Design a protein around this ligand. Structure first.
Ligand SMILES: Nc1ncnc2c1ncn2[C@H]1C[C@H](O)[C@@H](COP(=O)(O)OP(=O)(O)OP(=O)(O)O)O1
Ligand SMILES: Nc1ncnc2c1ncn2[C@H]1C[C@H](O)[C@@H](COP(=O)(O)OP(=O)(O)OP(=O)(O)O)O1
Ligand SMILES: Nc1ncnc2c1ncn2[C@H]1C[C@H](O)[C@@H](COP(=O)(O)OP(=O)(O)OP(=O)(O)O)O1
Ligand SMILES: Nc1ncnc2c1ncn2[C@H]1C[C@H](O)[C@@H](COP(=O)(O)OP(=O)(O)OP(=O)(O)O)O1
Ligand SMILES: [Mg+2]
Ligand SMILES: [Mg+2]
Ligand SMILES: [Mg+2]
Ligand SMILES: [Mg+2]
Ligand SMILES: [Mg+2]
Ligand SMILES: [Mg+2]
Ligand SMILES: [Mg+2]
Ligand SMILES: [Mg+2]
Lengths: 480, 480, 480, 479
């Protein structure tokens, strides 16, 4: 019981308080070693071997950096050792709830497998955190270091999932600023983003444009509407627009890579086919399924990327169909990308419409001679919502700033006070279409249906529309 | 045969012996004493880099791209001759730069020689001709299979464009693509940008988002309007918008830094006050001034950053006024920043309005108690044009693309086929105002004149407007 | 045809379609599930990288070196065929690694199957043959002008050396230089090292000063003894001694980290306790154990790090003992490090005496009051051989060099032609001792036994000797 | 209060307003015009960096180390006052460097003013006193709680050493503070750490040494009744590695054969100019390049600018100096012949340097020579390579602690670490150059040189057998 040191390639030598080490050295936390950060992105970017474990250490470290820096600069905030430790634990623990292949699991699998339940990694982290604390005798160790478990566990959980009028019980409103560090529900400017920017870039072979250390140096707490909040320096506003630009760039190049996504979808399909057969032991020896392991934390503890290899290496003929899809991934016999488009005008596609979309593509009537005829089931249509983290809103409208001539006066800055070269909108949708039949003739046909469907619905012209469907794109005067 | 040089940006670069002969002349070696970023070194202490090393990198990258095109498409008939002419142009396109780079071609020469129409481009061509004739390079070109008459023309055209329908004499339309490498007048996507992105970032301590090696891998030559041009791969379009975003971002953080610009302005003032008295010896022992050194290339060869120190260290009382300004830079008693604004609507401020602007700030009538009155000589107004390299135009409208299914077929891609989160405009103006009088009470007045002038002219609200002038900002209804 | 891959170490790497076909097989894709550094990930959290991405890098760098030699020396007659077989050997020399890489050939197989001698080199050859036969690669080789019979032999010889005076049948002596690229049996200077230096360091958070791109630039083929060999430039000799210094440094800081090794040892113990019960299905349905999967390549294909989690997640009481050891790794209840020593003088410690060493440490008779007496099986004693890759020999004595005045003339350089600051010896042994009993009193005893044992055997004084055993170290005159 | 500066090596550094006042002076700003690596820029084009930014980094890292020690061990009672004095020493210990850094006090001043002993450290002290007196810094020091009598003394002692317990600035219970900026006990200081990282960044060679790890592990313990900085025991390998890397950087970059010859050519030009250039000092007096060190107002104006004052001049009195500088621009350099070392314990002394070109021209190689060379055509450069403490092992002068008892200092010896370490910590390199550059002269030069190595029992040059096949068979060891 003194400070352990860990060497991390992103942050250097990180110091961990022994309470943190006790939390880290549990089956619940160490599980994160076996969950890839970027899921199926490893199958496109071979550097992306990193797991949630190391990401969590970095978020914990950075949470500590920010809280320590605010305390040194402004002792009048009364930040205690207790606060520091509570913010670091929340930083460490806000990835506990991720499942096999990270966003594959909460984004694709659980929505199809358990459409009735409303599941997020955030709730999962909270439940997994409760399990971690109770199973490993952490409450007495918290007490030992001057934490008060009733108040402080509440504080930690609220930092992860939000409130369970001043809505929080873990801290009063004079400590309001502390809720902005780990998971910032006001504007999304938090230390979780900063670690993944730096870490994902290191591994992906794409370079990070955002300087989080500069941001920490310029950060200050100021009063805004009778709450103490974190404020940025006025002239740093362009770097914040840039922060969100970079997040969107990373989603475009890497996290929504067309093949990475289809790999995630194939794994999802294999897990759906395996769900009847794979049994995971939870508490009291109760058996759970890949889809039901989220209902018992002892079972969820054992639910990791290992599932993929259990399926791949099985010999049970009940798992043949799941196994074959995973085998298609090994041979690179993947579902084929047909193309990408977007909606035009006001037109937004609704979450209830998603399931009907493969039918709409197979129903198009392209005027081209076709060998094969494809049906609904041969098409995947993937609808991706790209934004600045606040649906249609500009997150910088929800940031408070200060000027050097009056460092304790909060101000607001509007988009027109910064630049005319910024985005005029902050959300859009991407529609990717894939074909499950992979031969040259199926692929040719799939492209004709696709381009015709874009034309019927007045979506944007695919970039290669004139090459893949030269017979189709001249019908459309809106495209020349 | 080949020399090897170690560059921290590019690694071990190979140089042909003809390039070595060009490099080892006084005309090229001059570039060692010209800082890339001028007054930026006085704000970013890592920015010690000079034009010399940037030039080596531009030459190297020019060679990389031309070699890559030839290896992949032998049918283009790219010869060793072509390769060497492209590298020579890349090496020598910075020969024309003057003391503190953009300070000289951007502030000093406009103010000292408004009647001449001078660019660093024209200077590079003149300095290249002088380099060749002064050092016996034509026989060395012949040695390695160049034809000086054709090839010198080709090199100059790559630097400055046509010297005068196919407008170029150095190479025919079937080598059109060679003119897009070093200095791309079609859309500004060239190897010169790529080197300064990477090099400036290494030195500034800001990180580069753009990957030029990826670009080179995906580049191809295709037919467009009876010309063989360089085409990018369709789905690389996003990286191209990102390239220009990064150029703009670097101008905002570093190259147009408010203090870096004012330091450039103070140095320009000192150079104007010294221009009568400093002598630079050129051809046949005739003497030139800082402002006339551009008329003789032997004199220009000796016109470097050293001028700054020749003035600072002088004891001549005729240079007292010039020397005092440089002394104020060393003590950091600089002209003081008042604020930044932008125009609204269709209003674009022209080059011939610039002189009248300090006049208009002085003539504002702010209704407050002012303990002083300042006049127009006390104000600097700096007008900065920020764009994507093509005035109001979208340079990606001037890029040709190819699709994977037909790599020989060129296509175009529109802004709406890419994303709705892109800029709606591609040009804007920033206005910065500084005060030459620095005392407590002058600055308070200066702020009031400024904010009132912004309100008078319907310019945007300064970001700190409400703090620097609490009494001036309610009188303007267009600000809420 | 040409596929592009983005690797954080090398950038954008181009793969020929034959290489893609080899890569897209279960035998190659298996390498995604084998950590490069094994248990080093449990100490250095950035070391999540797997053998797969290392393999791509070795293949890429093999191509770099063979291409650079062809461009510079056309007279060598290096064919497209040769380039491909060198790249293939580079890609496939990691196929034979097993779970946790060096844990498996270095600790597990020796203890489980002591009679047979197995290496990852032999494994790669066997797994490569299996890859080719299982996936129809011989016809695809013919398609791109390889001659399967000759070229498969060439590839295998590059990986394991001669198969059975010029000993190679895959290529004649006029192409001997091709055997020094992937796996250099003469001196160990090869591209495999170059990739792992750069890659391991990226992930570990330790920086390496070896420049392989410089080495490749200076490399030439010359005649030595009726054989064409690769020669280095004379003045690059210092960088080669530095290369081996860096390898030794990496073994000291990371690859032989005292805790990383003990975690490797605990995993080995868990695998031995599980070996009777875990079953892997091989050819025609025959069943193998972890220890015997090396006898059938269909079984070996499915032998990866996943074995760790099958054991950890099991509920069978037959696996209780194996599972409990892995559980102790999760809770960080590791066998505890006691200290490090080395032999004095001539004293080598033999392959046979390893088993006796735990017995010896429990036999020492420290004159100290001890609350407990430890037995032999409570001690682990680890002997590490640290060298420059050729046991007692100086590998630079086996490097050929060339000089600037006569680039065709190979020469030798001796240690005294370089520096007096170099190592006088090139091999040494480290001895680490660990205690399986971890409470305060057993540990305190373990330190007395160990320090007394070091004194007994005239080994070096542990660095902490005077602190951990103050009553013991005055009995030895030589320690002062 | 605090200014922020962005440095590509250390990131965003915070500077106290007293440090800003010291920085914003002609004496400090002068460092912008002095290249860190002098003539190394003429070989490594990324090495454009100046002494200015290095100084900022040293000041920053001095602050890092002193702060880390204060946080971890409050009982040491390190004050805001101490921190500020350590940072000032760090910022100011490069003030005394002259044009082209080590060219000036390593080659020019020894040849131009052999009668005197001048070091960069002495210059730093003098330039610091000048900076303080000329810019009203004493009242500003007092404003921030410093006491100039003690504190100016403390700062100077940190830079040059002391001017029984030999220091007046601070007592023995703050002994450890003298180990931060310029460590005279073993050379493990923050000045090294900044130049490792910064030089590597610019040179395009990668840094092997982790200073942040060292700082996290460092502790203050009692050693012989002083409180000293101690390293953690098992990090001793990283310390041997630190000095190995310093040696590596000297071999690849700082003693590069062409960089040194360019330094030597610039020195020759500065000698040929020394009678004719005026530098105006205090009172109006005129000083020379060689005498500017005697007046700090004059030295303030002595920078790399001198190189271009010479190159651009038209005075016929500067013709000889100017022509040498011109030959550097055209790359018509003195040419490298070869490298050798002494043997046994031949140790070549500074008193014998002048004799060496004469010895090479006197060698009588048994070979037919179309041309003959004499002393004036040869340059002989002798480089002392060591671990910073001539013959000694600096790690024998480092104190360590163990994890089991962190307050207990101990010693560690070379055999407690590794058998693979250097078994000698100093050596000499001898490089020979020829001033005449045509094909026949170079052929001659190589015969003289190889014969000279043979005559003196120096090591066989690496290329000996190619450049001189007729000379190497005579010698008995070399075959
Ligand atoms: N020489 C080194 N350079 C860089 N990182 C290192 C080095 N040695 C170890 N590390 C890494 C591995 C870990 O992530 C981290 C801490 O390791 P280390 O100090 O070896 O701790 P430890 O817990 O094994 O030792 P102890 O408990 O004896 O202090 O630093
Ligand atoms: N060991 C090294 N590692 C990295 N860079 C180096 C090293 N040695 C020198 N350099 C740099 C300095 C130059 O930019 C470039 C060429 O240096 P070098 O190869 O020493 O050429 P040189 O011209 O002095 O030798 P020569 O003419 O004998 O071939 O590499
Ligand atoms: N914008 C980008 N910047 C950097 N790396 C990228 C980017 N996009 C993709 N990558 C990486 C992922 C892969 O490892 C490699 C090749 O990806 P990419 O060009 O997307 O191939 P792809 O196979 O999906 O396209 P296609 O088959 O359509 O040519 O580059
Ligand atoms: N956006 C940025 N990213 C990285 N570095 C920056 C950026 N902007 C400025 N820098 C550099 C330049 C300087 O080294 C340092 C401080 O610059 P900056 O904060 O602009 O200071 P300033 O002194 O001009 O502002 P002020 O006095 O208004 O606080 O950071
Ligand atoms: Mg430990
Ligand atoms: Mg978030
Ligand atoms: Mg050379
Ligand atoms: Mg341009
Ligand atoms: Mg593809
Ligand atoms: Mg090997
Ligand atoms: Mg400022
Ligand atoms: Mg020193």
């Amino acid at each position: 019981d003194t400070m352990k040191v860990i060497n991390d390639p992103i942050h250097g030598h990180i110091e961990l308080h022994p309470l943190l080490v006790r939390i880290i050295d549990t089956p619940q936390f160490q599980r994160l070693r076996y969950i890839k950060q970027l899921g199926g992105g490893y199958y496109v970017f071979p550097g992306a071997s990193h797991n949630r474990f190391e990401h969590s250490l970095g978020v914990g470290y950075l949470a500590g950096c920010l809280v320590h820096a605010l305390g040194e600069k402004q002792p009048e905030l009364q930040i205690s050792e207790r606060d520091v430790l509570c913010v670091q634990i929340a930083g460490l623990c806000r990835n506990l709830g991720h499942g096999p292949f990270s966003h594959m699991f909460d984004g694709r699998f659980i929505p199809l497998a358990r459409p009735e339940v409303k599941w997020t990694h955030e709730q999962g982290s909270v439940m997994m955190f409760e399990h971690l604390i109770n199973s490993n005798g952490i409450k007495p160790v918290m007490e030992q270091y001057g934490l008060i478990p009733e108040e402080d566990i509440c504080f930690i959980k609220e930092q992860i999932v939000g409130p369970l009028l001043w809505p929080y019980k873990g801290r009063p409103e004079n400590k309001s600023f502390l809720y902005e560090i780990v998971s910032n529900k006001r504007n999304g400017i938090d230390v979780d983003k900063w670690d993944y920017f730096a870490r994902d870039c290191h591994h992906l072979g794409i370079q990070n444009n955002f300087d989080y250390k500069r941001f920490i140096k310029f950060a200050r707490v100021c009063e805004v509407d009778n709450e103490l909040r974190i404020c940025a320096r006025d002239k740093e506003v362009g770097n914040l627009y840039d922060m969100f630009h970079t997040r969107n760039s990373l989603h475009r190049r890497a996290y929504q890579h067309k093949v990475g996504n289809i790999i995630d979808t194939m794994i999802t399909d294999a897990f759906l086919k395996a769900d009847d057969y794979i049994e995971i032991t939870g508490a009291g020896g109760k058996k759970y399924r890949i889809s039901t392991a989220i209902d018992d934390m002892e079972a969820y503890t054992k639910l990791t990327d290992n599932i993929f290899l259990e399926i791949l290496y099985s010999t049970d003929p009940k798992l043949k169909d799941a196994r074959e899809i995973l085998k298609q991934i090994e041979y690179r016999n993947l579902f084929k990308y047909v193309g990408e488009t977007q909606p035009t005008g006001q037109i937004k596609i609704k979450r209830e419409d998603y399931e009907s979309l493969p039918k709409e593509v197979a129903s198009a009537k392209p005027k081209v001679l076709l060998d094969v005829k494809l049906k609904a089931e041969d098409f995947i249509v993937d609808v991706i919502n790209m934004d600045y983290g606040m649906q249609e809103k500009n997150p910088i409208d929800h940031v408070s700033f200060y000027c050097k001539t009056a460092p304790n006066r909060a101000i607001r800055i509007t988009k027109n006070q910064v630049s005319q070269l910024l985005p005029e909108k902050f959300a859009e949708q991407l529609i990717r279409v894939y074909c499950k039949k992979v031969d040259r003739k199926s692929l040719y046909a799939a492209r004709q249906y696709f381009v015709q469907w874009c034309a019927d619905r007045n979506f944007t012209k695919p970039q290669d529309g004139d090459v893949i469907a030269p017979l189709i794109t001249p019908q459309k005067k809106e495209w020349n």
